[PDB]
Design an enzyme around this catalytic site. Structure first.
Site, PDB file in Angstrom:
ATOM      1  N   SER A  17       0.814  -1.201   0.000  1.00  0.00           N
ATOM      2  CA  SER A  17       0.000   0.000   0.000  1.00  0.00           C
ATOM      3  C   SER A  17       0.860   1.269   0.000  1.00  0.00           C
ATOM      4  O   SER A  17       0.386   2.317  -0.426  1.00  0.00           O
ATOM      5  CB  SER A  17      -0.956  -0.008   1.195  1.00  0.00           C
ATOM      6  N   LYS A  36      13.168  -3.095  -1.129  1.00  0.00           N
ATOM      7  CA  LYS A  36      11.891  -2.481  -0.754  1.00  0.00           C
ATOM      8  C   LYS A  36      12.055  -0.990  -0.736  1.00  0.00           C
ATOM      9  O   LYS A  36      12.956  -0.496  -0.068  1.00  0.00           O
ATOM     10  CB  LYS A  36      11.443  -2.945   0.625  1.00  0.00           C
ATOM     11  N   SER A  85      17.244 -10.056   1.352  1.00  0.00           N
ATOM     12  CA  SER A  85      17.489 -11.284   0.582  1.00  0.00           C
ATOM     13  C   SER A  85      16.277 -11.517  -0.269  1.00  0.00           C
ATOM     14  O   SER A  85      15.175 -11.204   0.132  1.00  0.00           O
ATOM     15  CB  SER A  85      17.771 -12.518   1.470  1.00  0.00           C
ATOM     16  N   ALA A  87      13.607 -13.753  -1.887  1.00  0.00           N
ATOM     17  CA  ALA A  87      12.968 -15.059  -1.704  1.00  0.00           C
ATOM     18  C   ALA A  87      12.382 -15.508  -3.038  1.00  0.00           C
ATOM     19  O   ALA A  87      11.246 -15.158  -3.383  1.00  0.00           O
ATOM     20  CB  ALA A  87      11.924 -14.989  -0.663  1.00  0.00           C
ATOM     21  N   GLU A  91       5.476 -16.473  -1.775  1.00  0.00           N
ATOM     22  CA  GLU A  91       4.655 -16.716  -0.609  1.00  0.00           C
ATOM     23  C   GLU A  91       4.218 -18.149  -0.465  1.00  0.00           C
ATOM     24  O   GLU A  91       3.862 -18.780  -1.453  1.00  0.00           O
ATOM     25  CB  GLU A  91       3.385 -15.873  -0.679  1.00  0.00           C
ATOM     26  N   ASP A 130       1.770 -10.402  13.069  1.00  0.00           N
ATOM     27  CA  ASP A 130       1.063 -10.598  11.807  1.00  0.00           C
ATOM     28  C   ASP A 130       1.562 -11.834  11.048  1.00  0.00           C
ATOM     29  O   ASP A 130       1.800 -11.813   9.831  1.00  0.00           O
ATOM     30  CB  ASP A 130       1.208  -9.354  10.934  1.00  0.00           C
ATOM     31  N   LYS A 132       1.322 -15.077   9.109  1.00  0.00           N
ATOM     32  CA  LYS A 132       0.333 -15.628   8.203  1.00  0.00           C
ATOM     33  C   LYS A 132       1.035 -16.136   6.930  1.00  0.00           C
ATOM     34  O   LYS A 132       2.146 -15.716   6.637  1.00  0.00           O
ATOM     35  CB  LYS A 132      -0.722 -14.575   7.848  1.00  0.00           C
ATOM     36  N   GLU A 134       0.943 -15.506   3.873  1.00  0.00           N
ATOM     37  CA  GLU A 134       1.348 -14.393   3.011  1.00  0.00           C
ATOM     38  C   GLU A 134       2.684 -13.799   3.407  1.00  0.00           C
ATOM     39  O   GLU A 134       3.383 -13.251   2.570  1.00  0.00           O
ATOM     40  CB  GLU A 134       0.305 -13.265   3.038  1.00  0.00           C
ATOM     41  N   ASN A 135       3.009 -13.885   4.698  1.00  0.00           N
ATOM     42  CA  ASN A 135       4.240 -13.311   5.252  1.00  0.00           C
ATOM     43  C   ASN A 135       5.369 -14.299   5.488  1.00  0.00           C
ATOM     44  O   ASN A 135       6.391 -13.960   6.120  1.00  0.00           O
ATOM     45  CB  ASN A 135       3.911 -12.601   6.575  1.00  0.00           C
ATOM     46  N   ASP A 148       7.911  -9.120   6.917  1.00  0.00           N
ATOM     47  CA  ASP A 148       6.875  -8.159   7.310  1.00  0.00           C
ATOM     48  C   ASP A 148       6.978  -7.819   8.787  1.00  0.00           C
ATOM     49  O   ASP A 148       6.117  -8.201   9.567  1.00  0.00           O
ATOM     50  CB  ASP A 148       5.460  -8.674   6.980  1.00  0.00           C
ATOM     51  N   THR A 170      -3.933  -9.256  11.209  1.00  0.00           N
ATOM     52  CA  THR A 170      -4.823  -9.643  10.127  1.00  0.00           C
ATOM     53  C   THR A 170      -5.992 -10.450  10.713  1.00  0.00           C
ATOM     54  O   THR A 170      -5.797 -11.412  11.464  1.00  0.00           O
ATOM     55  CB  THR A 170      -4.072 -10.476   9.053  1.00  0.00           C
TER      56      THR A 170
HETATM   57  N1  LIG Z   1      12.414 -10.257   0.227  1.00  0.00           N
HETATM   58  C1  LIG Z   1      11.525 -10.569  -0.720  1.00  0.00           C
HETATM   59  N2  LIG Z   1      11.737 -11.473  -1.703  1.00  0.00           N
HETATM   60  C2  LIG Z   1      10.778 -11.776  -2.598  1.00  0.00           C
HETATM   61  N3  LIG Z   1       9.569 -11.175  -2.597  1.00  0.00           N
HETATM   62  C3  LIG Z   1       9.257 -10.244  -1.650  1.00  0.00           C
HETATM   63  C4  LIG Z   1      10.239  -9.896  -0.633  1.00  0.00           C
HETATM   64  N4  LIG Z   1       9.712  -8.954   0.177  1.00  0.00           N
HETATM   65  C5  LIG Z   1       8.446  -8.728  -0.271  1.00  0.00           C
HETATM   66  N5  LIG Z   1       8.196  -9.492  -1.360  1.00  0.00           N
HETATM   67  C6  LIG Z   1       6.924  -9.497  -2.117  1.00  0.00           C
HETATM   68  O1  LIG Z   1       6.537  -8.156  -2.452  1.00  0.00           O
HETATM   69  C7  LIG Z   1       5.205  -7.952  -1.964  1.00  0.00           C
HETATM   70  C8  LIG Z   1       5.007  -6.548  -1.474  1.00  0.00           C
HETATM   71  O2  LIG Z   1       5.767  -6.450  -0.297  1.00  0.00           O
HETATM   72  P1  LIG Z   1       5.649  -5.177   0.652  1.00  0.00           P
HETATM   73  O3  LIG Z   1       6.225  -5.550   1.992  1.00  0.00           O
HETATM   74  O4  LIG Z   1       6.220  -4.017  -0.118  1.00  0.00           O
HETATM   75  O5  LIG Z   1       4.052  -4.954   0.745  1.00  0.00           O
HETATM   76  P2  LIG Z   1       2.975  -5.897   1.496  1.00  0.00           P
HETATM   77  O6  LIG Z   1       3.412  -6.094   2.931  1.00  0.00           O
HETATM   78  O7  LIG Z   1       2.599  -7.065   0.623  1.00  0.00           O
HETATM   79  O8  LIG Z   1       1.704  -4.920   1.371  1.00  0.00           O
HETATM   80  P3  LIG Z   1       0.927  -4.257   2.607  1.00  0.00           P
HETATM   81  O9  LIG Z   1       1.874  -3.189   3.105  1.00  0.00           O
HETATM   82  O10 LIG Z   1      -0.315  -3.742   1.931  1.00  0.00           O
HETATM   83  O11 LIG Z   1       0.699  -5.393   3.570  1.00  0.00           O
HETATM   84  C9  LIG Z   1       4.980  -8.938  -0.819  1.00  0.00           C
HETATM   85  O12 LIG Z   1       3.584  -9.228  -0.678  1.00  0.00           O
HETATM   86  C10 LIG Z   1       5.826 -10.101  -1.247  1.00  0.00           C
HETATM   87  O13 LIG Z   1       5.015 -10.980  -2.024  1.00  0.00           O
HETATM   88  O1  LIG Z   2      18.944   3.846   5.682  1.00  0.00           O
HETATM   89  C1  LIG Z   2      19.332   4.843   6.302  1.00  0.00           C
HETATM   90  O2  LIG Z   2      20.534   5.163   6.240  1.00  0.00           O
HETATM   91  C2  LIG Z   2      18.425   5.681   7.119  1.00  0.00           C
HETATM   92  C3  LIG Z   2      17.092   5.549   7.325  1.00  0.00           C
HETATM   93  C4  LIG Z   2      16.509   6.624   8.226  1.00  0.00           C
HETATM   94  C5  LIG Z   2      16.373   7.932   7.450  1.00  0.00           C
HETATM   95  C6  LIG Z   2      14.962   8.463   7.242  1.00  0.00           C
HETATM   96  C7  LIG Z   2      14.820   9.824   6.965  1.00  0.00           C
HETATM   97  C8  LIG Z   2      13.563  10.387   6.752  1.00  0.00           C
HETATM   98  C9  LIG Z   2      12.429   9.586   6.806  1.00  0.00           C
HETATM   99 CL1  LIG Z   2      10.806  10.298   6.526  1.00  0.00          CL
HETATM  100  C10 LIG Z   2      12.558   8.225   7.079  1.00  0.00           C
HETATM  101  C11 LIG Z   2      13.818   7.662   7.296  1.00  0.00           C
HETATM  102  C12 LIG Z   2      16.138   4.524   6.746  1.00  0.00           C
HETATM  103  C13 LIG Z   2      16.174   4.128   5.407  1.00  0.00           C
HETATM  104  C14 LIG Z   2      15.266   3.202   4.909  1.00  0.00           C
HETATM  105  C15 LIG Z   2      14.276   2.665   5.727  1.00  0.00           C
HETATM  106  C16 LIG Z   2      13.248   1.707   5.195  1.00  0.00           C
HETATM  107  C17 LIG Z   2      12.501   0.893   6.048  1.00  0.00           C
HETATM  108  C18 LIG Z   2      11.519   0.047   5.543  1.00  0.00           C
HETATM  109  C19 LIG Z   2      11.253   0.001   4.181  1.00  0.00           C
HETATM  110  C20 LIG Z   2      11.975   0.813   3.319  1.00  0.00           C
HETATM  111  C21 LIG Z   2      12.956   1.665   3.826  1.00  0.00           C
HETATM  112  C22 LIG Z   2      14.215   3.092   7.052  1.00  0.00           C
HETATM  113  C23 LIG Z   2      15.131   4.007   7.552  1.00  0.00           C
END
Ligand SMILES: Nc1ncnc2c1ncn2[C@@H]1O[C@H](COP(=O)(O)OP(=O)(O)OP(=O)(O)O)[C@@H](O)[C@H]1O
Ligand SMILES: O=C(O)/C=C(/CCc1ccc(Cl)cc1)c1ccc(-c2ccccc2)cc1
Length: 284
Positions: A17, A36, A85, A87, A91, A130, A132, A134-135, A148, A170
């Site tokens: 989302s 991501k 990493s 995967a 899922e 969470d 499940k 899916e995760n 997740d 969920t």
């Molecule tokens: N490390 C990974 N390797 C392979 N596929 C992945 C990995 N991480 C996430 N994915 C896939 O990408 C999809 C989106 O992941 P993301 O965490 O961005 O959103 P989500 O958790 O599915 O969505 P929401 O935030 O709505 O729950 C996941 O549902 C999963 O199928």
């Molecule tokens: O990586 C780094 O060096 C630093 C950070 C922290 C910096 C940071 C600055 C502003 C905002 Cl709004 C959010 C995070 C960081 C970067 C990515 C994530 C991240 C977490 C989950 C998904 C995608 C990215 C989180 C913190």
């Protein structure tokens, strides 16, 4: 710190989302990562920063073969990047839906890996909240890779914290205690575990309905049934996990932990050591 131009992006692996996961090759190593990516404007606008930070923080703490590994993080002016990493096999839910249910050998093997993972996670004082299908992703070797963690909770060791107050999860897998007491505990993941085992064998999770409220009502009443043919020792295990009182679930701290759970007759043939180095059974 790596930069986005350090990579070549390939296909999109999925979209959340407020996130996009993309397959990336690191130019200097030719290594594959699943990256991501979240837009700072969106998370800034939609109040999602605590989730982003949580995911990073929690994944930074994990070092175990049954979790998606966080290798690196970075940012630019528009986006936040999480290097994970890949995967390759996606899922677990996909396989459940494809073959409809797992035979006993496969159910046992994947349940054992999830127990192993939760033993690790709970040992570090972390609740998933969470869990499940899916995760639970699968790597190239068809071992599990749980993911997740944006809605996970690091319990404070300083205060001997046991309960978490944030309302997350969920509907199909949420614990009766979060619904009625408004908090979750490590044992809330064992309730999810029971739901997943059920689902592996029966093909659907045990509490189900076309909207969340109805599911909630079934959960708090323990209202569910086993299909006529359900592996009996697995049914017994499920009945020991889907227990309304969170202090009475097999594997919880009040029942003296993972020892008794791993000793359950359903796991008699399991070799718990180097599980991650065994060849998984084919799902077929
Ligand atoms: N490390 C990974 N390797 C392979 N596929 C992945 C990995 N991480 C996430 N994915 C896939 O990408 C999809 C989106 O992941 P993301 O965490 O961005 O959103 P989500 O958790 O599915 O969505 P929401 O935030 O709505 O729950 C996941 O549902 C999963 O199928
Ligand atoms: O990586 C780094 O060096 C630093 C950070 C922290 C910096 C940071 C600055 C502003 C905002 Cl709004 C959010 C995070 C960081 C970067 C990515 C994530 C991240 C977490 C989950 C998904 C995608 C990215 C989180 C913190």
């Amino acid at each position: 710190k790596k930069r986005p131009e350090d990579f070549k992006f390939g296909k999109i692996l999925g979209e959340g989302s407020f996130s996009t996961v993309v397959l990336a090759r690191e130019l200097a190593t030719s290594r594959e990562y699943a990256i991501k990516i979240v837009e700072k404007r969106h998370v800034h606008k939609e109040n999602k920063i605590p989730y982003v930070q949580r995911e990073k923080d929690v994944m930074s703490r994990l070092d175990h073969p049954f979790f998606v590994k966080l290798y690196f993080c970075f940012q630019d002016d528009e986006k936040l990047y999480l290097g994970l990493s890949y995967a390759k096999n996606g899922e677990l839910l996909k396989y459940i839906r494809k073959i409809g249910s797992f035979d006993e050998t496969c159910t046992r093997f994947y349940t054992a890996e999830i127990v192993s993972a939760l033993e690790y996670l709970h040992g570090k004082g972390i609740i998933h909240r969470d869990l499940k299908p899916e995760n639970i992703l699968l790597n190239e070797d068809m071992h599990i890779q749980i993911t997740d963690f944006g809605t996970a909770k690091v319990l404070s060791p300083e205060s001997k914290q046991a309960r978490a107050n944030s309302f997350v999860g969920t509907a199909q897998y949420v614990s009766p205690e979060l619904l009625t007491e408004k908090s979750a505990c490590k044992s809330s993941d064992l309730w999810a575990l029971g739901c997943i085992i059920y689902q592996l064998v029966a093909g659907l999770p045990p509490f189900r309905a076309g909207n969340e409220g109805l599911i909630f009502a079934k959960i708090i009443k323990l209202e569910y049934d086993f299909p006529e043919k359900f592996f009996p020792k697995a049914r017994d295990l499920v009945e020991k996990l889907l227990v309304l009182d969170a202090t009475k679930r097999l594997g919880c701290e009040e029942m003296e932990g993972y020892g008794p759970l791993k000793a359950h007759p359903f796991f008699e043939s399991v070799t718990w050591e180097n599980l991650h180095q065994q060849t998984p059974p084919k799902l077929t």
